[PDB]
Amino acid sequence: TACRVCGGGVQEFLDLGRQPLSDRFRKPDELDDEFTYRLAVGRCDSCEMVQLTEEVPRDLMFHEVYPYHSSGSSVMREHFAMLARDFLATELTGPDPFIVEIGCNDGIMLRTIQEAGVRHLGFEPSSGVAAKAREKGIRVRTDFFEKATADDVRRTEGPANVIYAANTLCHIPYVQSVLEGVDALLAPDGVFVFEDPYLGDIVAKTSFDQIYDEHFFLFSATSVQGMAQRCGFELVDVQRLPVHGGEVRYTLARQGSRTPSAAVAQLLAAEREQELSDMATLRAFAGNVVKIRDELTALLHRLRAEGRSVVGYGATAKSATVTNFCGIGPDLVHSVYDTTPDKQNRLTPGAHIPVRPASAFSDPYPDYALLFAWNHAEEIMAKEQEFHQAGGRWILYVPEVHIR
Numbered sequence: 001t002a003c004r005v006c007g008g009g010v011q012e013f014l015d016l017g018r019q020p021l022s023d024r025f026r027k028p029d030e031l032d033d034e035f036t037y038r039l040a041v042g043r044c045d046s047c048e049m050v051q052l053t054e055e056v057p058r059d060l061m062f063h064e065v066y067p068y069h070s071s072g073s074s075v076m077r078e079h080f081a082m083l084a085r086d087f088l089a090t091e092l093t094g095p096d097p098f099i100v101e102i103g104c105n106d107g108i109m110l111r112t113i114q115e116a117g118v119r120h121l122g123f124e125p126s127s128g129v130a131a132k133a134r135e136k137g138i139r140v141r142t143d144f145f146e147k148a149t150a151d152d153v154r155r156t157e158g159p160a161n162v163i164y165a166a167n168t169l170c171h172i173p174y175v176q177s178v179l180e181g182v183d184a185l186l187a188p189d190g191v192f193v194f195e196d197p198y199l200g201d202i203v204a205k206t207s208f209d210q211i212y213d214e215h216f217f218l219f220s221a222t223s224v225q226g227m228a229q230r231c232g233f234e235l236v237d238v239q240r241l242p243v244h245g246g247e248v249r250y251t252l253a254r255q256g257s258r259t260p261s262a263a264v265a266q267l268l269a270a271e272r273e274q275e276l277s278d279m280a281t282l283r284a285f286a287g288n289v290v291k292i293r294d295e296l297t298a299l300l301h302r303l304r305a306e307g308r309s310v311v312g313y314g315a316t317a318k319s320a321t322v323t324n325f326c327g328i329g330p331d332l333v334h335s336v337y338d339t340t341p342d343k344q345n346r347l348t349p350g351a352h353i354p355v356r357p358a359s360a361f362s363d364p365y366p367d368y369a370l371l372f373a374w375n376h377a378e379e380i381m382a383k384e385q386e387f388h389q390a391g392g393r394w395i396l397y398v399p400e401v402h403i404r
């Protein structure tokens with residue numbers, strides 16, 4: 001398997017087996033046939049980039065009915081509005097600024113930019129969520145960002161002061177093409193800023209559900225630094241973020257144009273000291289993944305034997321990994337509750353557990369809810385205080401299997 005960043009050899013360290021598309025929710029009457037692929041994760045020998053060993057073709061994952069709506073979380077809405085105001089105050093000052101967002105989804109970030117009157121363009125190849133962004137008055141192209149479409153925007157719109165990507169750069173195995181795109185499109189003094197699930201958090205929390213078809217890369221400061229350097233850029237800042245289970249926001253600039261913050265060296269040294277990306281570390285993680293599987297299925301089967309009812313909360317893409325790697329179906333978790341209309345009245349991928357609206361999670365409550373949207377715990381449990389007050393309990397599997 002050749003590394004997508006540098007062409008080095010990739011060594012597997014975790015095999016999560018056959019998996020379905022994580023974001024395909026079937027109607028109950030649909031033929032039980034899904035696309036499957038082998039989900040496994042390796043580390044490049046040369047650049048230390050951790051990445052999947054099989055690419056799902058982009059058109060199978062991202063298209064007209066892609067179901068994830070970013071704006072469905074109040075924490076994430078505030079998180080991106082804050083980010084946008086931060087760019088408006090720093091990188092987008094001065095005359096006729098231009099920001100391009102890769103993966104704008106329903107416009108969660110760009111709405112703030114558009115309300116500031118700033119020129120912008122979102123790339124969103126998933127046309128149904130693109131339309132939700134356009135309804136907010138955001139300018140969006142229903143295209144993948146890559147070298148050619150970047151060139152096209154550079155031709156018609158001129159250079160961008162900021163190119164931003166949240167939870168999208170790690171989805172893209174053709175990252176070199178994206179980088180060439182960024183090189184064509186970014187202002188000489190601009191920044192390419194992206195934030196994605198962080199390898200250090202996944203390792204520390206054993207959050208293996210962060211690994212599924214759409215998550216190609218599990219970035220670290222170490223791998224991102226190498227990737228930037230190889231493509232003509234430089235990692236010039238890093239910021240840790242609590243969202244989505246733990247992320248890092250990386251800022252890249254053209255090489256030598258800005259001086260790296262002390263934060264970059266500090267995080268690099270912490271990764272090296274902790275041996276984050278050493279194969280033995282990544283294998284110990286893989287062994288902990290198996291332990292969490294075994295304890296989670298033991299618990300779920302015991303709850304069944306003791307006549308306790310169990311549901312899931314949040315029809316996350318992440319959960320496809322949990323239910324298929326663990327073999328959890330509707331006989332152990334009867335329904336999954338979710339606020340996304342396009343996921344409701346459908347079945348989860350591979351495991352086929354029915355998804356019902358969150359409004360249906362109500363008195364009489366089940367005994368236990370398996371929290372798939374664990375990265376949204378605070379937001380979710382704040383809205384579901386009555387469940388817990390009535391004696392309903394949460395089952396979490398990050399960072400360990402526990403009930404509370």
Ligand SMILES: Cc1cn([C@H]2C[C@H](O)[C@@H](COP(=O)(O)OP(=O)(O)O[C@@H]3C[C@H](N)[C@@H](O)[C@@H](C)O3)O2)c(=O)[nH]c1=O
Pocket residue numbers: 068072073074167214215313314315316317318319337338339340343358373375376379380383
């Ligand atoms: C906050 C909240 C979420 N939900 C539902 C909405 C979503 O269907 C789900 C939460 O999904 P998530 O944890 O935001 O994201 P996913 O794991 O599904 O992954 C998606 C798809 C991307 N590839 C991934 O990187 C991230 C950005 O979003 O949980 C609720 O039902 N109640 C809630 O109160």
Ligand SMILES: Nc1ncnc2c1ncn2[C@@H]1O[C@H](CSCC[C@H](N)C(=O)O)[C@@H](O)[C@H]1O
Pocket residue numbers: 058062063066068070102103104105108123124125126129143144145146165166167168171172
């Ligand atoms: N090459 C590419 N260019 C632009 N967007 C892409 C892409 N490949 C996937 N996407 C979009 O990337 C998104 C990832 S989901 C992340 C959405 C949002 N930025 C958030 O952080 O919540 C999807 O909307 C998907 O359609």
Ligand SMILES: [Zn+2]
Pocket residue numbers: 003004005006007008044045046047048049
């Ligand atoms: Zn490599």
